[PDB]
């Protein structure tokens, strides 16, 4: 139990190190409680352009998002390495866990940056409106909506970084990823992680009953989003011609249901 508490603390601490923008910080900015200036608002084309602190509209946003999606994968890999037992695993299984886990964690943590009307960008320096991202052509104006939809559902659980540190370790340590060689040692780690999450939720949220259950239910909603996001990529395969995909994102998306 002191084991369970110390594992919560350690996860929390590396979470702080790995991820430059926490939910606390995002929340303080989003609710106007900050002091730390106020983000530049992007609600259209001209505001996108003045928001400066190469090609076509929706493509520009697409490519931008790619630099930060790469960076997010780097951050999450850093963080995964900190999960006790992770770097003790077979090297191919480590890759698999990341390969399949990273999207689910991006979506989860992207909620932290969202309200129903928009999203923080440039680590809190910017605010891009939901309606604007929706105004992009083709398959591009349909990428964010199911994220906002999920963020509204997920944010009502009212988790803080302490909770989230553990939840994302749980997601990474999923023994049910395809092509995994040694399932057992992954599931023994996750078992342990679920016990720390369960105790963490009880103590930090003593009045919000069955939160544990409800959080775990969100794992079906995360995986539908992943499913959807990939089908939208497959539309950018044919519909769009010259569209540089980043090598890291390529190997992430190569052979993934």
């Amino acid at each position: 139990s002191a084991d369970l508490r110390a594992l919560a603390k350690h996860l929390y601490d590396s979470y702080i190190k790995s991820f430059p923008l926490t939910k606390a910080k995002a929340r303080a900015i989003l609710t106007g409680k900050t002091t730390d200036k106020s983000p530049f608002v992007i609600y259209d084309m001209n505001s996108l352009m003045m928001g400066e602190d190469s090609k076509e509209v929706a493509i520009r946003i697409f490519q931008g998002c790619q630099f930060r999606s790469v960076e997010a994968v780097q951050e999450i890999t850093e963080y995964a390495k900190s999960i006790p037992g992770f770097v003790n695993l077979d090297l191919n299984d480590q890759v698999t866990l990341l390969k399949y886990g990273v999207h689910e964690i991006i979506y989860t943590m992207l909620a932290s940056l969202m309200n129903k009307d928009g999203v923080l960008i440039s680590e809190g320096q910017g605010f891009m409106t939901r309606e604007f991202l929706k105004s992009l052509r083709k398959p591009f104006g349909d990428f964010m909506e199911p994220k906002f939809e999920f963020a509204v559902k997920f944010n009502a659980l009212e988790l803080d970084d302490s909770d989230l540190a553990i939840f994302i370790a749980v997601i990474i340590l999923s023994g049910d990823r395809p092509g995994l060689l040694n399932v057992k040692p992954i599931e023994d780690i996750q078992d342990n992680l679920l016990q720390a999450l369960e105790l963490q939720l009880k103590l930090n949220h003593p009045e919000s009953s069955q939160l544990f259950a409800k959080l775990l239910q969100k794992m079906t909603d995360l995986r539908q989003i992943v499913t959807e996001h990939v089908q939208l990529l497959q539309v950018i395969k044919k519909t769009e011609t010259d569209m540089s995909l980043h090598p890291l994102l390529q190997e992430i998306y190569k052979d993934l249901y």
């Binding site: 994968v73 780097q74 890999t77 850093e78 390495k81 770097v87 090297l91 480590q94 890759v95 990341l98 390969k99 090598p247 890291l248 190997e251 992430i252 190569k254 052979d255």
Partner: peptide, 16 residues
């Protein structure tokens, strides 16, 4: 297959 960069992230850490 192979996953050059992931292997390399797991091994070298980031970037600066």
């Amino acid at each position: 297959e192979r996953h050059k960069i992931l292997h390399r992230l797991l091994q070298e850490g980031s970037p600066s």
